[PDB]
Amino acid sequence: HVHSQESLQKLVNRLSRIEGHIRGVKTMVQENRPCPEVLIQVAAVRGALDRVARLILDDHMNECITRAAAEGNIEQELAELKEALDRFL
Amino acid sequence: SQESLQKLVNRLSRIEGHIRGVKTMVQENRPCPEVLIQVAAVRGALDRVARLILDDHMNECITRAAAEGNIEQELAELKEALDRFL
Amino acid sequence: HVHSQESLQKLVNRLSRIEGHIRGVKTMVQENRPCPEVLIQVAAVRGALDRVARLILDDHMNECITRAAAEGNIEQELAELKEALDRFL
Amino acid sequence: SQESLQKLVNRLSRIEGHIRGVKTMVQENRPCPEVLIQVAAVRGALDRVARLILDDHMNECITRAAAEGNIEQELAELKEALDRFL
């Protein structure tokens, strides 16, 4: 890669897919499908969520390190990154 | 069943509503930490649902072992479920 | 497998290995080795810890389900299992 | 450095002592939940150490970017570190 900001619309998309996938898990439960099948689908949803989170974080990181090079305020930018990682982890 | 199933459906509807909430936040260009705080809550909610489903599975396995034995088989089912839950 | 209880001594062993592995991470830090190398070693220690935890849990689960078949007290045994999972997760 | 390195060494010595504590508990046949409560604390401590090491790495990368640029390269180092940290 050379890093590209994920478009707002690209993120909204990924989130719509995650919504549809949760609605799918709900259908599975109503049909009394086996517990391991349901858990497999829940795991996939959680994986999808993590990848969205990770994309949002990458773009944030990019702004922080870019703003540091541009403007030189390393302390502020570190502290911004660390907040975002706190809430991500 | 009718009792417990509906509770899970409900939780899953709430999670769905919460993901819509995260979508709205993104469209409104709200700060990253606020969006991630909401994503963390969704992830927490998903974990608790996963945990409830595992509890019911484990309940069936142990209940069936008490009733009908085949303890080795049931134990091995429990361990396989834990393999995929972690 | 047919399930076998991990011996007390087998567990003490695995824990001694984890101790030695943490002491190894400490040496790496004193020698100012690169951060990704150090984190790779920390991950391995965490993995080793998880596998120990998992073994202790498997043996507990085995006692709970065995005691349920033997004695029939499903409620007590479920609640024992769930406590152990609470502190494991 | 001499300052920060020693703090990490210390944390790692405490983690080592804590794993000995878990070993003693097992030899004394203490209940499973008590042993797992102590293992959870060790795992927590290990996570915090991992997090401190990542913070220092990230600090070097951003600091070097402000001083000397090559922002794309540094960003890619940060993302690679996060790949392995999760």
3-state secondary structure chain B: CHHHHHHHHHHHHHHHHHHHHHHHHHHCCCCHHHHHHHHHHHHHHHHHHHHHHHHHHHHHHHHHHHHHCCHHHHHHHHHHHHHHHC
CA dist., res. D54 & res. B36, Å (int): 19
Domains located in chain C, CATH noted: 1-89 (1.20.58.1000)
C-beta atoms of C62 and B75 within 8 A:
yes
Phi, psi dihedral angles at A61 (to 5 degrees): -55, -50
CA dist., res. B57 & res. D63, Å (int): 51
Tokens of B22: 């995260």
**Does residue B42 belong to the interface with chain A, where contact is any CB pair within 8 Å?**
yes
Q: Which of A29, A45, A84 sits opposite B9 (nearest CB)?
A: A29
The residue of chain D with its CA nearest to that of C18 is D19
User: What is the CB neighbour count within 10 angstroms for residue C45?
Assistant: 25
Burial code (b: 16+ CB inside 10 Å, e: under 16) for C17-36 equals: ebbebbeebbebbeeeeebb
C-beta atoms of B33 and A87 within 8 A:
yes
Chain D residues in contact with C6 by the CB 8 A cut-off are: none
**Does residue D45 belong to the interface with chain C, where contact is any CB pair within 8 Å?**
no
C-beta atoms of C49 and D37 within 8 A:
no
Chain B residues in contact with A84 by the CB 8 A cut-off are: 32-33, 36
**Does residue D7 belong to the interface with chain C, where contact is any CB pair within 8 Å?**
no
Question: What is the structure's resolution, reported in angstroms to one decimal?
Answer: 2.4
CA dist., res. B61 & res. B78, Å (int): 7
Burial class (CB in 10 A: 0-12, 13-18, 19+), B2: exposed
